[PDB]
Design a protein around this ligand. Structure first.
Ligand SMILES: CCCCCCCCCCCC(=O)O
Ligand SMILES: CCCCCCCCCCCC(=O)O
Lengths: 61, 277, 178, 252, 277, 252, 61
């Protein structure tokens, strides 16, 4: 089938950890949640300044 | 993958580097870390922000509504349910959604329907399993005015038929909004003359949802309580905002009563002594 | 006229009628009583969402000797309905000149904020109005009618589309037929 | 010196010798609507320099007991030159805006303001049982002010500062595009807001895209013989202004 | 794939091109678009007519019939159901099918059977789960005259045995019509002498459907209501036509009462003032 | 068939089934001001579709005794949508204009009009000893009309047709961009006027770039029972509209 | 098996979107609806004329 093997979340016996998935429905809205999308970009809220500010330097000068 | 930043080993310092000094006036949040203001050791941090994901945060079934409808036609008891779909009548889920201004996602809707037999002196029965019918009516569709209205024919409106005992009915729905994203806040009006409806209700219109017993009638009065659950998935959120501070008063607007910024305490220097040998 | 062919008749007369509004209506393909029942609107009522442009074709049914120019205007939501020709003329309009070509199309462009609109249009998803006026007037020779009929046709464009399947509110019953 | 900065939009230019960088919305800069995101089929109009220029609103006085102020756009600019004229004649609008709040004092004065831009700043009513009136939400270039105590008005906005008239904590408004005006270091605040909405365009009279709030966290103070008049002027300039749905002007 | 047409960017004009001018007399529908009568901007339209498909339009379970049958043999109550299959007794689905003159498709039939115990003073029971039997009898097959008729042997006729509590019984059927397509309208007669039956009933004959309780008998009177649902799939439709305007009167013909073309209003120039600051 | 023609400018479209070609000014077509001919250093504004669209003026009635009419632009369009708004807020302006005069009758009516565009149509006074008043030269979209006889007004324009109020022969007005509306063959007249002036740009209130005159050389006539109401409507659309010198709107 | 992978309908997280299908029954009437057949030809009803009519031209001449 259109099987798609992904990686499972670390277990309590770490340091065959993968699962299989197949969509049965025609609408993408039927698929399960995307609990594995780990994107980040705090810059939008933490550093929305026009002029890049270097940590080790004075904010104003 | 969603790992956290490690702490670089830092040693003594004595330079013109001023990572600790800054100016919040710029609207810039300091990007300082422990290693910048002290001597730190190397630490391979394996922690992950996997559960902080907007997906994992909002993707959890939460009750959004609940109504009761009876079987027999006695007194002025409603024999069917009606509901103008929205998630502003349940503070819990409503508060989360309101952490963001706009939202976009598909949704998993689950229904928990339970019945009972109203108290009585002589109520010996033998009623077969109760079958329910939940029908979604998008804005404009004909609305039923009785538990025998022609509208229940469900010619094109999506509907579910469930019998008690079985697993709670469920079904997914895409992104209905006619806009590019659901709006939790609308600082505007419904009319161009700046009047009429103000806020959410001014534009949101997900239609209505009706329920009923498909069973003709019960010997003695019985009632059922349907609980609607929402679980957004394939989530997208924009423009974060200050969480709700004041309790929710109305489900149509943001009215509130002047609430305290937080709990009080003795003085600014008050710290409970927890060490008393 | 709810049960006569006069319901489709849009009279136009000879003589001074400047400042007079020949006709007008809202742009609710599925809610407006004027479109509500046309092939187009009749289908939209099986859906809750709609989007796209609309083609309003006007046909002059007067005699071959009658002449005239009409101003077909369309005003997007936001202001009051055009009370004068000047106000209507400020919006998307079409000056139709009657001649050999009987019909004239007034394509109402899709100028909405949102991608879609509700068939059960409310003030939020307002579409605007359409008002018709006399650009000049209807001149006619001797021995020729002074009143003429102007039929109106409505249909969707290649950019039209419905979206939310629902039941039509134009049919019901009180018991099984027999 | 990054202290000095210059802004030029249209036939207007602002100068500063004590600024603190420039906040750019949510990392984005104003831009015209793209073809793969447009809905209105009619060709939009772009007055450019005609509407995209600096518009100065009525100044406000900062007093030792001032609780704050707030403006709603684009409504507040309904009577500003040609920018307001396009709002009347068009059904749809879209703009950027460059907020520039000015406020100077002296090395002997003290105080700290919080210039913030709150998208969809839906506000509550004084009487939780009633509704609010547009007249109480925004009144042209005339600023509405926050009160240090609860309000009672029939259809008035709950001006009590601590809740910012939104039922939230004022200390958390920092989550919106903002800057502070700490008199001992500042002199003004600039914020470049990009078009933020759940729709490509929208009406500019019916919808108040965002609210500008200037709330002081450090009370204005000074000694005797020190200028007691400390005004706070707000200047804003639209960016990438587009308009659709041309028709008869709307009667206010 | 089923995408909508995009709008080409158009500029000023001044030529002998007359896309706005035409003649409906030809029976040709103008193929004009906004860009032909004004200046338009380029717009990549991603909208899709995927839900306008005749398949997605008609492929939705809609109730087509409903009857009630009792368990005990008391009074003159029918203990079994009989039905001359057709979709002309439920206006909703009937109106959709009638949007086209001819139809061809397979079909998914679902049954929603629910029971109950009729009211009484002393009705204490303990009846086991009720099992039902639905039998299809194609034209000509022997018809049962009782809940114990030999016909219920279902030797070759398709039949379903369902017990309450379980999911509503379902089963698909192909294209039965002896013609190349189902006919929603038949402007003809059953007899060559131009008399007898006129219309639908003149040729359509999908047979009959019977139902009953396989349970021998109940201590106290009980009744069940069966609801038949049709969901055409693998659809094909021909010759579209004007939707039904007048309410449906009979389920055997198209009789109607002179109905209004549409709702009324003040005047041809009437337009409600919704802008009042 | 060159009889039928279609015009599209902005959100407006005109249709014709009995036209007679199209006169294009002095062989030139409207165009924006080039850099090697500009004077105003500020970047001009070009509303485009916002102002460059068809504006219909008050219709006029053609009678068996009508002597003529005349309009002055761009003045006549001072109250027309956004085109008029830019005239108020700007010191300098520049536009093309597409004049389209409509007038239909029937194969049983007769008459012939002369649609002309006269650049710098400086007119004389009724009383040669006095001067004229702007109010008598142009009055908005309201047309002034020529008289078959001499006028006497104090500061009125010498409306006597034969001299076109310019002290010249009406039969020589054909030297200006024009067209005729011979009812037996026509139905309208279109003229595309290019910006004509001795200066790159100019004020639009103080200067009347050109005058549109509609003078009938063949008296309107017809038999009994034949529509006696024969209106003449004028529609004009600016082209390549540019504006400079943005400032506070001018109080009319 | 006789698996057949197709494309799912766009989801609310666009701009692995495919599903698998296998028929278990012997009759084609048992298969699911054909919700993905997007064919069109309005010409039958909008332009059923014998002589092609060019938009930018007069209907009659
Ligand atoms: C078939 C049931 C359909 C129910 C539609 C629910 C839509 C929920 C939308 C929530 C909008 C919001 O929270 O801003
Ligand atoms: C096994 C049950 C068989 C039921 C046959 C139903 C056939 C429905 C045909 C509908 C014909 C029509 O709608 O024109």
């Amino acid at each position: 089938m259109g099987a798609q093997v992904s990686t499972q979340k670390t277990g309590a016996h770490e340091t065959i950890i993968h699962y299989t998935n197949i969509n049965y429905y025609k609408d993408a809205a039927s698929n399960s949640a995307n609990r594995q999308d780990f994107t980040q970009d705090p810059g939008k809220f933490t550093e929305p300044v026009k002029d890049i500010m270097i940590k080790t330097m004075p904010a104003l000068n | 993958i969603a790992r956290v930043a490690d702490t670089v080993a830092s040693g003594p310092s004595n330079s013109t580097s001023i990572p600790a000094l800054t100016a919040v006036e710029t609207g810039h949040t300091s990007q300082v870390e422990p290693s910048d203001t002290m001597q730190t050791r190397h630490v391979k941090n394996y922690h992950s922000r996997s559960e902080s994901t907007v997906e994992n945060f909002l993707s959890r079934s939460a009750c959004v509504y609940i109504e009761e409808y009876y079987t027999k036609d006695q007194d002025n008891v409603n024999r069917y349910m009606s509901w103008t779909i929205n998630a502003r009548r349940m503070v819990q889920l409503r508060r989360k959604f309101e952490l963001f201004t706009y939202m976009r996602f598909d949704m998993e809707i689950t229904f928990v329907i339970t019945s009972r037999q109203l108290p009585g002196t002589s109520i010996a029965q033998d009623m077969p399993p109760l079958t329910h019918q939940i029908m979604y009516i998008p804005p404009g569709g004909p609305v039923p005015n009785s538990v025998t209205d022609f509208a229940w024919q469900t010619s094109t409106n999506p509907s579910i038929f469930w019998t008690e005992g079985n697993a709670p009915p469920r079904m997914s729905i895409p992104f209905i909004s006619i806009g590019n994203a659901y709006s939790n806040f609308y600082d505007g009006w419904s009319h161009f003359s700046q009047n009429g409806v103000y806020g959410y209700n001014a534009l949101n219109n997900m239609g209505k949802l009706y329920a009923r017993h498909v069973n003709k009638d019960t010997p003695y009065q019985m009632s059922s309580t349907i609980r609607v659950y929402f679980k957004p998935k394939h989530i997208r959120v924009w423009v974060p905002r200050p969480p709700r501070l004041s309790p929710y008063i109305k489900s149509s607007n943001v009215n509130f009563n002047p609430t305290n910024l937080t709990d009080e305490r003795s003085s600014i220097t008050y710290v409970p002594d927890t060490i008393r040998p | 006229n709810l049960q006569s062919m006069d319901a489709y008749h849009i009279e136009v007369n000879t003589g001074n009628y400047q400042g007079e509004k020949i006709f007008a209506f809202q742009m609710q393909p599925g809610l407006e009583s004027v479109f509500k029942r046309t092939l187009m609107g009749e289908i939209l009522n099986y859906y809750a969402h709609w989007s796209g442009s609309i083609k309003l074709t006007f046909t002059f049914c007067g005699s071959a000797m009658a002449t005239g120019k009409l101003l077909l205007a369309y005003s997007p939501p936001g202001a009051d309905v055009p009370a004068t020709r000047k106000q209507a003329m400020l919006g998307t309009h079409m000056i139709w000149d009657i001649g050999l070509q009987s019909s004239c199309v007034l394509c109402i462009p899709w100028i909405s904020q949102t991608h879609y609109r509700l068939v059960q249009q409310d003030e939020y998803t307002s579409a605007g109005n359409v008002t018709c006026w006399y650009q000049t007037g209807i001149v006619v020779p001797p021995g020729t009618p002074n009143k003429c009929v102007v039929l109106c046709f409505a249909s969707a464009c290649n950019d039209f589309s419905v979206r939310m399947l629902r039941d039509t509110p134009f049919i019901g019953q009180t018991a099984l037929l027999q | 010196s990054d202290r000095v900065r210059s802004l030029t939009l249209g036939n207007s230019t602002i100068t500063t010798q004590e600024s603190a960088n420039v906040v750019v919305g949510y990392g984005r800069w104003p831009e015209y609507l793209r073809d793969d995101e447009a809905t209105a089929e009619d060709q939009p109009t772009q007055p450019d320099v005609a509407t995209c220029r600096f518009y100065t609103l009525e100044s406000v006085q900062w007093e030792k007991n001032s609780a704050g102020w707030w403006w709603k756009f684009p409504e507040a600019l309904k009577d500003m030159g040609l920018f307001g004229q396009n709002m009347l004649y068009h059904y749809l609008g879209r703009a950027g805006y460059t907020i520039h709040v000015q406020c100077n004092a002296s090395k002997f004065h003290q105080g700290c303001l919080l210039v913030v831009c709150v998208p969809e700043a839906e506000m509550g009513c004084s009487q939780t049982d009633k509704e609010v009136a547009a007249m109480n939400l925004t009144k042209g270039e005339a600023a509405h002010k926050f009160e240090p105590t609860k309000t009672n008005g029939e259809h008035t906005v709950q001006s009590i500062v601590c809740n910012a008239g939104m039922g939230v904590g004022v200390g958390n408004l920092t989550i919106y595009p903002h800057q502070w005006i700490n008199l001992r270091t500042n002199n003004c605040a600039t914020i470049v807001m990009p078009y933020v909405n759940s729709v490509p365009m929208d009406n500019m009279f019916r919808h108040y895209n965002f609210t500008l709030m200037v709330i002081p966290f450090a009370p204005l103070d000074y000694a005797a013989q020190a200028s007691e008049y400390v005004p706070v002027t707000v200047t804003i300039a639209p960016m990438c202004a587009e308009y659709n749905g041309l028709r008869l002007a709307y009667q206010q």
